[PDB]
Amino acid sequence: ATHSTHKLLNALSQASFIHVRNGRNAIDFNRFNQAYLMHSTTSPLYAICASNDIAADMMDGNSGRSLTDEVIRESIDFRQSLAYLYKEFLNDDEWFFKPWNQEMVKDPATGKRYAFEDAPVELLMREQSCWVMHPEDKWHGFNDIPDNWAMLDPIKVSILAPGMGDDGKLLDTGVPAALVTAWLNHYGIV
């Protein structure tokens, strides 16, 4: 497993990890070290390694759970607010952006169904099945996907501009995402 510690953990650019779990046909340290040296430098900048070390420490113990919880909760708040606004504008027969997630979520304990924007935040934060891609759902659009195969990461939030039909063909009207991207770039969001 390779982690870019600078991407979604807290580390400086170029910091990375190689993680190995030894199994069949494992590579011992003496053999692996040759490749490691082949793609490294003889004068590493120790600030990068220090950032790797502090990132690992930051995920250690209770703090990793707490930090991932905070990010997931922020993303869920954004998704639910956007879904609510989308429903409001739809009720006023207007267009808006919608988050790319499940429309309806089911509570596996009580069997109760909720609209995504009405689901309790604890349920969305706790239950994995609220994010699994089910073959019977139309939101993800991956036809013939097996159940319990893939899952949506809550913190990578995709929003959909109107214009694409559920069947795969364009609607009569829509807003292309290139123009929205130009707007966001103008306001600094990339």
At its nearest, how many Å lie between a second copy and the CB of residue 131? Answer: 19
3-state SS, the chain, equals CEEECCCCCCCCCCCEEECCCCCCCCCCHHHHHHHHHHCCCCCCCHHHHHHHHHHHHHHCCHHHHHHHHHHHHHHHHHHHHHHHHHHHHHHCCCCCCEECCCCEEECCCCCCEEEHHHCCHHHHHHCHHHCECCCCCCCCCCCCCCCCCCECCCCCCCEECCCECCCCCECCCCCCHHHHHHHHHHCCCC
At its nearest, how many Å lie between a second copy and the CB of residue 122? Answer: 20
CB nearer to a second copy: pick between 93 and 167: 93
* Interacting residue with a second copy among 93, 144, 166, 167 (CB under 8 A): 93
* Residue 92 touching a second copy (CB under 8 A): yes
Q: Please give the residues from 69 up to 88 whose contact with a second copy meets the rule CB under 8 A.
A: 87
CB nearer to a second copy: pick between 7 and 112: 112
* Interacting residue with a second copy among 30, 91, 143, 173 (CB under 8 A): 91
* Interacting residue with a second copy among 26, 27, 71, 104 (CB under 8 A): 104
* Residue 60 touching a second copy (CB under 8 A): no
Catalog residues that contact a second copy under the rule CB under 8 A.
Answer: 87, 91-93, 103-104, 113, 115
